[PDB]
Amino acid sequence: NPQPVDTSNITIPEKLEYFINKYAEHSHDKWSMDKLANGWIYGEIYSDSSKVQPLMKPYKLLSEKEKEIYRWPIKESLKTMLAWGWRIERTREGDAAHGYSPRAIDMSNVTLSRDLHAMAEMMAENYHNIWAKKKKLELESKGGGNHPLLVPYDTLTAKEKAKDREKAQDILKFLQINGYAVSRG
């Protein structure tokens, strides 16, 4: 059975509430780096072939209503780890276009360790069975049928894995940008 995970089991603990702001600014710099790497510029006049992205909203002046395009990939990472009983262990911390140019850290530099490779595979195996069941929940009440890739793990493709391994490691790559190593236990 494809195994989903929930986000509303517990309120967010205090060592993890003040964690979000560095994680949300880092997920802001990575949702912008994918789109602003070709020649798109945020502006006013909205179309498809006029090289202006209206969806590129900044992180600075955002209120409560227009937050759920950034926090929505976050709530499927932070509270989903909080759906098993995982408490973060902390260690010693350490290390053109026209518009928004963040001096952030790319996700193409973090090579994990053994305690984090064995933990991120628990997240990367998890993320495939959620969306496999998310489409199962989407496609059973509309006259649902059968899906090809609900099969066991060694009989999949590479593009759906590489697109979902990166988001599961988006915690651990950013946690090694901050430098807090996690133990397995």
PDB file of all heavy atoms in Angstrom, residues 103-120, unseen atoms left out:
ATOM      1  N   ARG A 103      22.132  36.409  -2.825  1.00  0.00           N
ATOM      2  CA  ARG A 103      23.466  35.832  -2.642  1.00  0.00           C
ATOM      3  C   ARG A 103      23.405  34.578  -1.777  1.00  0.00           C
ATOM      4  O   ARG A 103      24.070  34.471  -0.749  1.00  0.00           O
ATOM      5  CB  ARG A 103      24.407  36.866  -2.040  1.00  0.00           C
ATOM      6  N   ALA A 104      22.599  33.611  -2.203  1.00  0.00           N
ATOM      7  CA  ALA A 104      22.327  32.423  -1.413  1.00  0.00           C
ATOM      8  C   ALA A 104      23.250  31.281  -1.833  1.00  0.00           C
ATOM      9  O   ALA A 104      24.176  31.449  -2.631  1.00  0.00           O
ATOM     10  CB  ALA A 104      20.858  32.031  -1.540  1.00  0.00           C
ATOM     11  N   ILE A 105      22.988  30.095  -1.294  1.00  0.00           N
ATOM     12  CA  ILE A 105      23.803  28.908  -1.519  1.00  0.00           C
ATOM     13  C   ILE A 105      22.992  27.940  -2.369  1.00  0.00           C
ATOM     14  O   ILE A 105      21.839  27.630  -2.043  1.00  0.00           O
ATOM     15  CB  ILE A 105      24.233  28.266  -0.191  1.00  0.00           C
ATOM     16  CG1 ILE A 105      25.015  29.275   0.659  1.00  0.00           C
ATOM     17  CG2 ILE A 105      25.066  27.020  -0.439  1.00  0.00           C
ATOM     18  CD1 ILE A 105      24.245  29.825   1.846  1.00  0.00           C
ATOM     19  N   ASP A 106      23.587  27.477  -3.464  1.00  0.00           N
ATOM     20  CA  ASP A 106      22.923  26.521  -4.334  1.00  0.00           C
ATOM     21  C   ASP A 106      22.829  25.157  -3.654  1.00  0.00           C
ATOM     22  O   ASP A 106      23.566  24.847  -2.714  1.00  0.00           O
ATOM     23  CB  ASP A 106      23.668  26.404  -5.665  1.00  0.00           C
ATOM     24  CG  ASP A 106      22.788  25.886  -6.782  1.00  0.00           C
ATOM     25  OD1 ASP A 106      22.474  24.677  -6.784  1.00  0.00           O
ATOM     26  OD2 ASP A 106      22.403  26.691  -7.656  1.00  0.00           O
ATOM     27  N   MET A 107      21.896  24.338  -4.136  1.00  0.00           N
ATOM     28  CA  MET A 107      21.744  22.972  -3.664  1.00  0.00           C
ATOM     29  C   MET A 107      22.599  21.985  -4.448  1.00  0.00           C
ATOM     30  O   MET A 107      22.345  20.777  -4.389  1.00  0.00           O
ATOM     31  CB  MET A 107      20.275  22.551  -3.724  1.00  0.00           C
ATOM     32  CG  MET A 107      19.386  23.293  -2.743  1.00  0.00           C
ATOM     33  SD  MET A 107      20.004  23.196  -1.055  1.00  0.00           S
ATOM     34  CE  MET A 107      18.475  23.041  -0.139  1.00  0.00           C
ATOM     35  N   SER A 108      23.606  22.473  -5.175  1.00  0.00           N
ATOM     36  CA  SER A 108      24.510  21.643  -5.962  1.00  0.00           C
ATOM     37  C   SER A 108      25.890  21.526  -5.324  1.00  0.00           C
ATOM     38  O   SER A 108      26.891  21.390  -6.033  1.00  0.00           O
ATOM     39  CB  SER A 108      24.630  22.193  -7.382  1.00  0.00           C
ATOM     40  OG  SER A 108      23.366  22.583  -7.891  1.00  0.00           O
ATOM     41  N   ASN A 109      25.965  21.587  -3.997  1.00  0.00           N
ATOM     42  CA  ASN A 109      27.236  21.515  -3.290  1.00  0.00           C
ATOM     43  C   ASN A 109      27.242  20.564  -2.102  1.00  0.00           C
ATOM     44  O   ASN A 109      28.323  20.174  -1.652  1.00  0.00           O
ATOM     45  CB  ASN A 109      27.667  22.917  -2.814  1.00  0.00           C
ATOM     46  CG  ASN A 109      26.503  23.760  -2.318  1.00  0.00           C
ATOM     47  OD1 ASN A 109      25.759  23.357  -1.428  1.00  0.00           O
ATOM     48  ND2 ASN A 109      26.353  24.947  -2.891  1.00  0.00           N
ATOM     49  N   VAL A 110      26.080  20.172  -1.589  1.00  0.00           N
ATOM     50  CA  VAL A 110      25.988  19.345  -0.393  1.00  0.00           C
ATOM     51  C   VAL A 110      26.077  17.879  -0.785  1.00  0.00           C
ATOM     52  O   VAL A 110      25.180  17.350  -1.455  1.00  0.00           O
ATOM     53  CB  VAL A 110      24.690  19.615   0.379  1.00  0.00           C
ATOM     54  CG1 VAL A 110      24.745  18.927   1.718  1.00  0.00           C
ATOM     55  CG2 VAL A 110      24.467  21.101   0.557  1.00  0.00           C
ATOM     56  N   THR A 111      27.146  17.216  -0.352  1.00  0.00           N
ATOM     57  CA  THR A 111      27.263  15.766  -0.421  1.00  0.00           C
ATOM     58  C   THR A 111      27.118  15.225   0.994  1.00  0.00           C
ATOM     59  O   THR A 111      27.847  15.641   1.900  1.00  0.00           O
ATOM     60  CB  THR A 111      28.597  15.326  -1.044  1.00  0.00           C
ATOM     61  OG1 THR A 111      28.875  16.123  -2.203  1.00  0.00           O
ATOM     62  CG2 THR A 111      28.544  13.860  -1.456  1.00  0.00           C
ATOM     63  N   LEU A 112      26.181  14.303   1.174  1.00  0.00           N
ATOM     64  CA  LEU A 112      25.692  13.928   2.491  1.00  0.00           C
ATOM     65  C   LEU A 112      26.686  12.990   3.179  1.00  0.00           C
ATOM     66  O   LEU A 112      27.695  12.582   2.600  1.00  0.00           O
ATOM     67  CB  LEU A 112      24.308  13.289   2.367  1.00  0.00           C
ATOM     68  CG  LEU A 112      23.052  14.151   2.158  1.00  0.00           C
ATOM     69  CD1 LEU A 112      22.923  14.693   0.738  1.00  0.00           C
ATOM     70  CD2 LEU A 112      21.808  13.360   2.531  1.00  0.00           C
ATOM     71  N   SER A 113      26.402  12.639   4.430  1.00  0.00           N
ATOM     72  CA  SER A 113      27.157  11.645   5.180  1.00  0.00           C
ATOM     73  C   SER A 113      26.302  10.395   5.370  1.00  0.00           C
ATOM     74  O   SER A 113      25.176  10.308   4.875  1.00  0.00           O
ATOM     75  CB  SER A 113      27.615  12.214   6.523  1.00  0.00           C
ATOM     76  OG  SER A 113      26.513  12.652   7.295  1.00  0.00           O
ATOM     77  N   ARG A 114      26.847   9.426   6.109  1.00  0.00           N
ATOM     78  CA  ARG A 114      26.191   8.127   6.244  1.00  0.00           C
ATOM     79  C   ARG A 114      24.927   8.218   7.094  1.00  0.00           C
ATOM     80  O   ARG A 114      23.943   7.514   6.836  1.00  0.00           O
ATOM     81  CB  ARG A 114      27.165   7.120   6.849  1.00  0.00           C
ATOM     82  CG  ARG A 114      26.648   5.699   6.889  1.00  0.00           C
ATOM     83  CD  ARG A 114      27.560   4.813   7.710  1.00  0.00           C
ATOM     84  NE  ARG A 114      27.657   5.275   9.091  1.00  0.00           N
ATOM     85  CZ  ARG A 114      26.759   5.013  10.036  1.00  0.00           C
ATOM     86  NH1 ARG A 114      25.685   4.287   9.758  1.00  0.00           N
ATOM     87  NH2 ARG A 114      26.937   5.475  11.265  1.00  0.00           N
ATOM     88  N   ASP A 115      24.929   9.095   8.101  1.00  0.00           N
ATOM     89  CA  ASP A 115      23.762   9.247   8.964  1.00  0.00           C
ATOM     90  C   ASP A 115      22.642   9.998   8.250  1.00  0.00           C
ATOM     91  O   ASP A 115      21.474   9.909   8.643  1.00  0.00           O
ATOM     92  CB  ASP A 115      24.163   9.964  10.255  1.00  0.00           C
ATOM     93  CG  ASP A 115      25.080   9.123  11.134  1.00  0.00           C
ATOM     94  OD1 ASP A 115      24.951   7.884  11.122  1.00  0.00           O
ATOM     95  OD2 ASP A 115      25.939   9.701  11.830  1.00  0.00           O
ATOM     96  N   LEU A 116      22.984  10.740   7.192  1.00  0.00           N
ATOM     97  CA  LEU A 116      21.983  11.522   6.474  1.00  0.00           C
ATOM     98  C   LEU A 116      21.569  10.842   5.173  1.00  0.00           C
ATOM     99  O   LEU A 116      20.451  11.050   4.692  1.00  0.00           O
ATOM    100  CB  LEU A 116      22.520  12.924   6.202  1.00  0.00           C
ATOM    101  CG  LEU A 116      23.342  13.559   7.320  1.00  0.00           C
ATOM    102  CD1 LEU A 116      23.999  14.837   6.829  1.00  0.00           C
ATOM    103  CD2 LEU A 116      22.471  13.832   8.526  1.00  0.00           C
ATOM    104  N   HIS A 117      22.461  10.039   4.581  1.00  0.00           N
ATOM    105  CA  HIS A 117      22.092   9.239   3.415  1.00  0.00           C
ATOM    106  C   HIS A 117      21.095   8.148   3.782  1.00  0.00           C
ATOM    107  O   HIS A 117      20.168   7.869   3.014  1.00  0.00           O
ATOM    108  CB  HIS A 117      23.338   8.617   2.778  1.00  0.00           C
ATOM    109  CG  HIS A 117      23.109   8.053   1.411  1.00  0.00           C
ATOM    110  ND1 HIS A 117      24.032   7.253   0.775  1.00  0.00           N
ATOM    111  CD2 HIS A 117      22.070   8.185   0.552  1.00  0.00           C
ATOM    112  CE1 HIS A 117      23.570   6.910  -0.416  1.00  0.00           C
ATOM    113  NE2 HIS A 117      22.382   7.462  -0.576  1.00  0.00           N
ATOM    114  N   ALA A 118      21.266   7.526   4.948  1.00  0.00           N
ATOM    115  CA  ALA A 118      20.304   6.529   5.405  1.00  0.00           C
ATOM    116  C   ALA A 118      19.008   7.182   5.876  1.00  0.00           C
ATOM    117  O   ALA A 118      17.970   6.520   5.956  1.00  0.00           O
ATOM    118  CB  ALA A 118      20.918   5.676   6.514  1.00  0.00           C
ATOM    119  N   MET A 119      19.048   8.472   6.220  1.00  0.00           N
ATOM    120  CA  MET A 119      17.820   9.147   6.639  1.00  0.00           C
ATOM    121  C   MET A 119      17.075   9.753   5.453  1.00  0.00           C
ATOM    122  O   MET A 119      15.840   9.764   5.447  1.00  0.00           O
ATOM    123  CB  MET A 119      18.135  10.215   7.694  1.00  0.00           C
ATOM    124  CG  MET A 119      16.900  10.778   8.403  1.00  0.00           C
ATOM    125  SD  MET A 119      16.105  12.224   7.672  1.00  0.00           S
ATOM    126  CE  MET A 119      17.138  13.520   8.327  1.00  0.00           C
ATOM    127  N   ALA A 120      17.798  10.267   4.451  1.00  0.00           N
ATOM    128  CA  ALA A 120      17.126  10.863   3.301  1.00  0.00           C
ATOM    129  C   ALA A 120      16.499   9.809   2.400  1.00  0.00           C
ATOM    130  O   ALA A 120      15.558  10.118   1.659  1.00  0.00           O
ATOM    131  CB  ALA A 120      18.095  11.721   2.496  1.00  0.00           C
TER     132      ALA A 120
END
